[PDB]
Design a protein around this ligand. Structure first.
Ligand code: HEC
Ligand code: HEC
Ligand code: HEC
Ligand SMILES: [Ca+2]
Ligand SMILES: [Ca+2]
Ligand SMILES: [Ca+2]
Ligand SMILES: [Ca+2]
Ligand SMILES: [Ca+2]
Ligand SMILES: [Ca+2]
Ligand SMILES: [Ca+2]
Ligand SMILES: [Ca+2]
Ligand SMILES: [Ca+2]
Ligand SMILES: [Cu+2]
Lengths: 106, 106, 106
């Protein structure tokens, strides 16, 4: 997928996670987010097409998904255990990471 | 290790995983695959020696191991739990990822 | 944080882990190490300021944290399970990875 299909996959599944009722549904939505975040790590954001492919800011932009992918990983494991409320809370606190990168390059 | 020693480590341990009987053996072979996949992520594939070190295709080639390393991670956790059959099935479905990258740069 | 604040976070938490008594304390210190190791992956080490931003040695330097981040991950999961002694032993065997990179670029 391209960058914004991924971004609309991170967002849709955030709402799904906040509204889910069993482990399976949270586990399902986080698994999608992780694939999306990894695929996103390829792309070149609009704001940085006018700069060099290995701009430091292009490296800052890839590092931001590592933070994100590692927090989906913790969230996912809570879900695999069945601590649904804890998994829901972890997913909710991802918006810090989404919106840190957002104000830089969005 | 170099690129093809790693590739022959991914392959040998695939057969090992498909033929194992306890959690320990699957866990052992997947742990080897993860080290191999990470070490592989360094290398420069033959097909891309004649292109620039930061070719997009050299970045596509490193991204492919992330997909791979993250699916070994799930497989490994099933094994740590003891769901041997589920871990065996996850390892089997890695060949999609092996052969996606393969037709591009192998 | 900058590179050496991260390095002094990896070190402080190593001692903390070796001296902890419950799962929670090990889990706490490893979680800090993982954030530190990821943040460190950005930086450019002193020894390699006088070389190109995408030196192979600058790529070797980022690969070293993957090895490190993936071994904190295993350690952390032992701690989440409550195998404190096993988690303590995993953290102790990280110094191989710390000191492999150290003799290259420290
Ligand atoms: C950088 C490391 C980012 C992280 C982490 C997240 N997002 Fe993101 N986002 C980023 C960029 C550069 C852009 C602009 C891309 C563009 O096409 O203009 C975006 C955009 C979005 C969007 C809008 C999609 C669209 O149709 O325009 C959404 C809905 C979005 N981002 C959501 C989102 C969520 C929920 C995140 C955390 C889970 C998240 N993003 C992380 C860069 C980055
Ligand atoms: C790219 C991201 C790859 C992934 C993921 C996997 N492989 Fe791979 N493989 C890749 C390249 C560029 C090459 C050519 C390297 C060369 O030395 O010519 C290969 C090669 C192999 C081989 C052959 C080893 C040899 O002696 O020539 C094998 C056995 C192999 N690959 C196996 C394999 C398996 C089982 C994978 C999934 C677990 C896998 N590879 C992933 C690139 C990539
Ligand atoms: C490279 C991939 C490294 C890994 C993995 C670890 N360290 Fe490291 N370390 C690295 C460099 C290039 C440097 C020099 C940076 C500098 O500021 O000079 C260091 C330095 C340290 C330090 C000293 C901090 C200071 O105030 O100078 C410490 C205490 C340290 N490193 C500890 C440490 C530990 C405990 C590690 C494993 C858990 C570890 N490092 C990994 C590069 C790399
Ligand atoms: Ca949209
Ligand atoms: Ca609900
Ligand atoms: Ca509901
Ligand atoms: Ca061979
Ligand atoms: Ca068998
Ligand atoms: Ca057998
Ligand atoms: Ca110091
Ligand atoms: Ca003690
Ligand atoms: Ca004590
Ligand atoms: Cu895990």
């Amino acid at each position: 997928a391209d960058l914004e299909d991924n971004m609309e996959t991170l967002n849709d599944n955030l709402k799904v996670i906040e509204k889910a009722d069993n482990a399976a549904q949270v586990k399902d939505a986080l698994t999608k987010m992780r694939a999306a975040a990894l695929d996103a790590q390829k792309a070149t954001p609009p704001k940085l097409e006018d700069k060099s492919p290995d701009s430091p800011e292009m490296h800052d932009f890839r590092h931001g998904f590592n933070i994100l992918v590692w927090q989906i990983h913790d969230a996912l494991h809570l879900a695999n255990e069945g601590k649904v409320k804890e998994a829901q809370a972890a997913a909710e606190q991802l918006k810090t990471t989404c919106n840190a990168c957002h104000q830089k390059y969005r």
